[PDB]
Amino acid sequence: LQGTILQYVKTLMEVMPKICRLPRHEYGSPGILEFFHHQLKDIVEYAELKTVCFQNLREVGNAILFCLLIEQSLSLEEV
Amino acid sequence: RSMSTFGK
Amino acid sequence: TRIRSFLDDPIWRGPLPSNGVMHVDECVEFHRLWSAMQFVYCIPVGTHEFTVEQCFGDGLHWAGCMIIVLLGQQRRFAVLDFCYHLLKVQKHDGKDEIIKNVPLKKMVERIRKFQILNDEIITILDKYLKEHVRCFQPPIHQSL
Amino acid sequence: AIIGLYNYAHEMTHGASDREYPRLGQMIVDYENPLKKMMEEFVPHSKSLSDALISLQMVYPRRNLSADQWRNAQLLSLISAPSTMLNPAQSDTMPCEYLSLDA
Amino acid sequence: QPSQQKLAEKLTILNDRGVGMLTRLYNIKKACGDPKAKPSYLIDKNLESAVKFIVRKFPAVLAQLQKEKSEILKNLALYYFTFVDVMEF
Amino acid sequence: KVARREIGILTTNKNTSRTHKIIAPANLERPVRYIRKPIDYTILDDIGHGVK
């Protein structure tokens, strides 16, 4: 969190569109999908989004799940 | 009911 | 509780909102970045490509949602999320096209799945995470 | 039947109809066709009643719009105009803003 | 004396009274619309001969009925004076 | 004891309790009898600036 993820968060945050409105219903879903595609193009195209960002997050998530699951096993063992 | 065995 | 203390860098929460209440259109909070990431992994892939769930499992979303919850951004994420908005509108107009090789119908079908997943995780985190409210001043007569 | 029965039993016990019966029995038959009776009864009320109802022109129509028109106005939205989230939501007809449309 | 007509008070008090009358009337209608909660006298076959006469004459004005006169005053008094209150309202 | 002291640091009270599905009030509501009383246009005279 304070290392690679933080680094990439600060990086992508600048790649992020400074502002991004939620278009009225009038524009229609097809147009809204097109609007988001354009506004978030640089995030969609970011090369290390999966190999690094998602990967690092998956590791943190698994760590959290392990703590939760291990405690549950411990509770069953204790009871 | 505090558990002193766990340092409580 | 101890993990939240790992998120002290100002980048997560961003600067103060202009309206003195909350950010709305600005993308300076983490949950917004997560919304963009969610937009990415909701995009349908080829029939013979592997998906984000087949590659990362639920662990990816447990992390993203945890950061959001710990930052206390889960409510604004629900309101301001891009995909949630697209789903909302599509259910209204019931339209189905292919925008940038993205079949709108399948796109919103996946968004719904991750929405159900996100809600479950966020609810669970909030449950385990189980005071002072910022008030505002009413208009003051320039006199006094 | 109820009113009649009670009164019969009253004059069968006290040798006289219930004090309220004559007038009560007369109301029952007069308002037998409620709206017809009241339509003529309200002739002298028509002036004040009309004025009151007509004032609803400034409320009912704008309170009785469609979903599309609600979406066009972005009704009840707090984020449609982010710069005004602090400002008090107000009109000069406050009680008319939430007055039951059904009423 | 338009400043002593007490319109605000009278409107408030009557409006409240009105809801009360509606509430009472509502229950009478439901009760009388259900041959299970309806007053026994309107159900008993041996009396319908008389009720028909009283209603056909209404408001203008009985062998068995004579004996149960005290029973009728007691059991219809509630509905009767509810109607009376509706009139006075 | 040493092992438990080490894991105790990572713990906190789980505020769980046990109650009944339905808890009736100490005093059930008293059945009020209906009594007819005439319309009274003076019951609001003591509220605000009344007019007798």
DSSP for C80-126 reads H-HHHHHHHHHHHH----EETTEEHHHHHHHHHHHHHHHHHHHHHHH
Residues 6+ apart with CB under 8 A from D65: D73
One-letter amino acid at F26 equals: A
Residue A13: count of CB within 10 angstroms of its CB: 18
Contact C26, A22 (CB under 8 A): no
Instruction: Give CA–CA dist A16/A34, Å, rounded.
Output: 17
Number of H helices, E strands in chain F: 1, 0
| Half-sphere exposure of residue C12: CA atoms within 13 angstroms, side-chain side | 19
By Cβ distance, the residue of F36, F39, F51 closest to E6 is F51
Residues 6+ apart with CB under 8 A from D30: D37
Residue D97: count of CB within 10 angstroms of its CB: 11
DSSP C6: G
- Identify the experimental approach: X-ray
Instruction: Give CA–CA dist C88/C91, Å, rounded.
Output: 6
Instruction: Give CA–CA dist F16/E2, Å, rounded.
Output: 66
Q: Write the burial class of residue C78 (CB in 10 Å: 0-12 exposed, 13-18 middle, 19+ buried).
A: middle
The residues with which C26 forms a beta bridge, in sequence order, are: A19
Q: Do chains C and B touch (3 or more CB pairs under 8 A)?
A: no
How close, in Å, is residue C86 to chain D by CA atoms? 16
Q: For residue C21, which residues of chain D lie inside 8 Å, CB to CB?
A: 85-86
DSSP A50: I
The residue in chain A having the minimum alpha-carbon distance to the alpha carbon of residue C94 is A29
Q: Which two tokens stand for residue D103?
A: 């009423």
CA distances from C77 to C18, C83, C122, E61 (A): 18, 11, 11, 77
E10–F contact, CB cutoff 8 A: yes
Q: Which two tokens stand for residue C6?
A: 């790992």
Resolution, given in Å to one decimal, reads 2.4
At which residue do the structure tokens 């039951």 appear? D100
How close, in Å, is residue C143 to chain A by CA atoms? 38
Instruction: Give CA–CA dist C12/C24, Å, rounded.
Output: 16
At which residue do the structure tokens 């339509």 appear? D39
Question: Coil, strand or helix: which one is E7?
Answer: helix
Contact state of C22 with D86 under an 8 Å Cβ cutoff? no
Q: Sign of the C-alpha dihedral, residues E36, E38, E41, E43?
A: negative
Q: Write the burial class of residue A15 (CB in 10 Å: 0-12 exposed, 13-18 middle, 19+ buried).
A: middle
CA distances from D98 to A16, C68, C138, D53, D63 (A): 41, 36, 21, 18, 9
Instruction: Give CA–CA dist D87/E72, Å, rounded.
Output: 66
Question: Coil, strand or helix: which one is D92?
Answer: coil
Buried b / exposed e over E14-53, threshold 16 CB at 10 Å, is eeeeeeebeebeeeeeeeeeeeeeebebeeeeebeebbee
A60–C contact, CB cutoff 8 A: yes
| Best mutation target, B3, B6, B8, to test chain F (most F CBs within 10 A) | B6
By Cβ distance, the residue of A30, A43, A60 closest to C63 is A60
CA distances from D100 to A3, D57, D65, D92, E12 (A): 57, 15, 14, 17, 18
Residues 6+ apart with CB under 8 A from A4: A52, A56
F39–E contact, CB cutoff 8 A: yes
Instruction: Give CA–CA dist C26/C32, Å, rounded.
Output: 9
By Cβ distance, the residue of E10, E85, E88 closest to F41 is E10
Give the residue ranges of DSSP H helices in chain E.
7-32, 45-57, 69-88
By Cβ distance, the residue of A25, A29, A54 closest to C60 is A54
Q: Do chains D and E touch (3 or more CB pairs under 8 A)?
A: yes
CA distances from C16 to C11, C13, C21, C23, C26 (A): 12, 9, 8, 8, 11
Contact C3, A4 (CB under 8 A): no
Q: Do chains B and A touch (3 or more CB pairs under 8 A)?
A: no
